[PDB]
Every structure is written in C-alpha cells, then in structure tokens.
From a paper:
The ESCRT-III-like protein Vipp1 couples filament polymerization with membrane remodeling. It assembles planar sheets as well as 3D rings and helical polymers, all implicated in mitigating plastid-associated membrane stress. PspA activity is triggered by agents that threaten inner membrane integrity, including phage, mislocalized secretins, and antibiotics, whereas Vipp1 is a plastid component in cyanobacteria, algae, and plants, in which it functions in thylakoid membrane biogenesis and repair. Given that two-dimensional (2D) planar sheets share a close geometric relationship with helical lattices, and as a means of understanding the interconnectedness of Vipp1 polymers including rings, spirals and planar sheets, we determined the structure of four Vipp1 helical filaments by cryo-EM.
Numbering used by the authors:
A (entry chain A): 1 to 107
B (entry chain A), C (entry chain A): 1 to 54
D (entry chain A): 55 to 107
E (entry chain A), F (entry chain A): 108 to 161
G (entry chain A), H (entry chain A): 162 to 214
The structure:
Amino acid sequence: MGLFDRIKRVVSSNLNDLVNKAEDPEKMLEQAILEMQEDLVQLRQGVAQAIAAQKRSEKQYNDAQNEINKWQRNAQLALQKGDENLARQALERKKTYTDTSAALKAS
Amino acid sequence: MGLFDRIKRVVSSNLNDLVNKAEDPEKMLEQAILEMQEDLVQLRQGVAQAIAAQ
Amino acid sequence: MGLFDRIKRVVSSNLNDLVNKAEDPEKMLEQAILEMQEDLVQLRQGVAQAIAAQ
Amino acid sequence: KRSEKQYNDAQNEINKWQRNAQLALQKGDENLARQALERKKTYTDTSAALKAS
Amino acid sequence: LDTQSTQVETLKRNLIQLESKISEAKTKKEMLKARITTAKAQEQLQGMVRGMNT
Amino acid sequence: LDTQSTQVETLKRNLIQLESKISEAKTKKEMLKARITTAKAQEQLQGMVRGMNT
Amino acid sequence: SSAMSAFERMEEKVLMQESRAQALGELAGADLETQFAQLEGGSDVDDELAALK
Amino acid sequence: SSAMSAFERMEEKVLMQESRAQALGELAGADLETQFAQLEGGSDVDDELAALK
C-alpha cells in the first residue's frame, strides 16, 4: 500500500538523519582507509595465488622438457646393449612427453 | 541494510580513535620487536627440525 | 532430473569446502602413515600365512 | 655508536674470513675455504647494509 | 594374442590421451579458480571515479 | 613344493618392494612435514616491504 | 585408494603452500635489479670464488 | 559336478584376481626403462654375481 510506502519512507528519514548527526569528518575517514587496505590485502593474496599456480605448473613443463632429452639418454643407454625395441618405445614415450611439454609450454 | 552498515561504520570510527589515542610511539614499538623475535624463534625451531630430519 | 542433479552438485560444493577448511597439513599427514602401516601389517600377515602353508 | 659495533665486526671479518680460508686451504681442503667465502659474502652484504645505515 | 595386443595398445593410447586431457583440464581449473579469486575482490576495489560509489 | 617356492619368492619380492615403498614414503612424509612447519610461520614473517602490512 | 588419496592430496597441498610462501617474496621486492641480485650475487661473488680458488 | 564346478570357478577367479594385482603395477610405472630395470637388474647384478661366484 501507498500508505505503507509513505509511512516507511517517513520512518527512514529520521534514522538517516540521526546517522548523519553522529558523523564526524576526520574520524570517519579512517575506516574508508582501513577497509580499503584490508580488501587490498585480499586482492594481492589472490594475485600471489595466481603467480604461485603458474610457478607450480611450470614444474611439469620443466620435467617434460628436461625429459625430452633424458629419454634420448635412456634410448642411447638401451641401444648400447643392442636392443632396438626399448629405444623405440623410449622414442614413442619421448614423443608423448614432448607433445605434453608443448601443450604445457603454450599453457 | 544500508542503515545498519552506516550506523556500524559510525560506531567503529570512535573505538578506532580511542585506540589511536592510547597509542604511545616509543612504548608501542616494543611489541613490534618482541613478537617478531618470538615467531623468529618458532621459525628457527622448524629449521632445526628439518635439519634434524635430514 | 537436471534440476535435481544441479541442486545436488550445488549442495556438495559446500560440504566439500567446509571439509577442505578443517584440513591441517601437518596433522593430516599422520593418518596417511598410520593406515598405510596398518594395511602393511595385514599384507605381511598374508605373506607369513603363505610361507607357513608352504 | 653501538650499531657501529656490528659493522666494525663485519668489516674486520671481511678479512678475517680470507684469513680463515687461507688457514683452511693451507691443509689442501677447498670446501672449507669455499664455505668461508660464502659466509664472507654474507657478512660483506651485512656490512654494506650496516655501513649504509 | 596379437589381436589383443593391438587392442591393448589402442586401449593404452586411449587412456594416455584421456589422462592428459583430465590433467590439462585440472591445470586450467586451478588457473581459472585463481582468476575467480582475483575477480571476486577486484570488483569491490577499483578506481575512485568521482561519479559513482558502487 | 617347487611351485610354492617360486610363489613364496615372488611373494618375498612383493613385500620387500612394498616395505621399501612405505618406508621411503614415510621419509618423504617427515621431510614434507618439516617443510610445512617452516612455511606455516614463514608466511607470518617475511621482508618488511614498506608498501604492505600483511 | 583411501590412505593413498589422503597422501597425494596433502602432498599437493604442501606443494601449493611452498609455492605461495615463495610467491610472497617473489610478489614483493625492493627493485627488479634487487630481485636479480638476490637471485645471483653478481660479478663480485664470481671474482671472489676465482681468487680464493 | 557341483563341488567340482565351485572349485574351478573360484580357481579362475583367483587367476584373474592375481592378474589384476600384477596389472596395476604393470599399468603404472615410473618409466619404461624403470619398468625394465625392475624386471631385470642389469649389468650391475650380473657383474656382482660373476665376481662373488
């Protein structure tokens, strides 16, 4: 009801003014800084988390990229006994890990 | 409610200033050192534990 | 119903996070060791039983 | 005049550590002298910071 | 046995590919979750344009 | 008896390997628990960059 | 497995925790050149290593 | 037969169970060369056997 609307707006217009009465300009500004700083802390925490996630996902790519050569080393150590199936499977796994490394490097 | 938000911020802005009033620059700095040292003790305890585990 | 599926997934995504909240890294690792050791005991009991049967 | 104490210690130590490294390598050990160099670099950075202060 | 060898190798390729997919998907999950965490507070904190409160 | 001898030796190898695994895993558990204990206090104590409180 | 899914979870938790711990400093820093000097001592340490060695 | 059809069934069940148990590791593995080294010790064990023998 319009009656209820207008009576409610009438009751708000007194609390609003008591609140404006107990306002102090200097002292009040302090919160406008404290809360800004706190939520800034939260935001930079999120920034740090993103940084850390990237620096962690770099781990698998580093493993795979050094492995792109460790697998050649394994294939060499295998063929040094004269076996070609082991070196060939090492090549296949190296190709798999190289594709993984390429995807992870793009990421 | 916006009313409640603003009334609460109004009540905080007085406790905050009483706290800033009972602040003493020299004397206050002491805790900033004591607690740093205590948590430093904790950190070095952890360092020692890692050393010992190895 | 898709409605029921999505409402259920919504309710799980809060219990899951409360559980992740009451997680403590050090203290938690203890069970990962205790239960491993207990089932290791069971496995070696079976090994002993095979030995004894032979 | 008190904070000058640590800087004096570290600056004389920037050479006492070379002395220790020499006394160590005089037996033919290089790890001890190398760790002496590392600690000397640490104490030299400390000395530089303290001298700026 | 040769036929089953072909089958198991084509089943080995299957699983490798799908494990790679789920792993990369989890990587994207983490990066996007970080994205969300940035945004959530970000929208409470932005430039102080004089013509809005927000 | 020879067949069971093969079985018990292949069961001896099993258990040795799995005991080695659980033992190395416990070693990693301890080292990582030390890691955690370092980190926990470490993040309350870091450089005093003038542009943050944290 | 139960005891094996608990282990891997806390392991990844450890990894992320250490990554954050390093990130805080990695996020902060006196200056990019100060960050690089912290990473690597510079010509001074190389010269000291060569001379003592 | 009844008692003989129960026996054979559980026997084949045993066989499949052990095959799976070995498959889990056979399915997993640190590296194909690591798998082969696990299968066979390598030149080191042969040399040790020859020397001690």
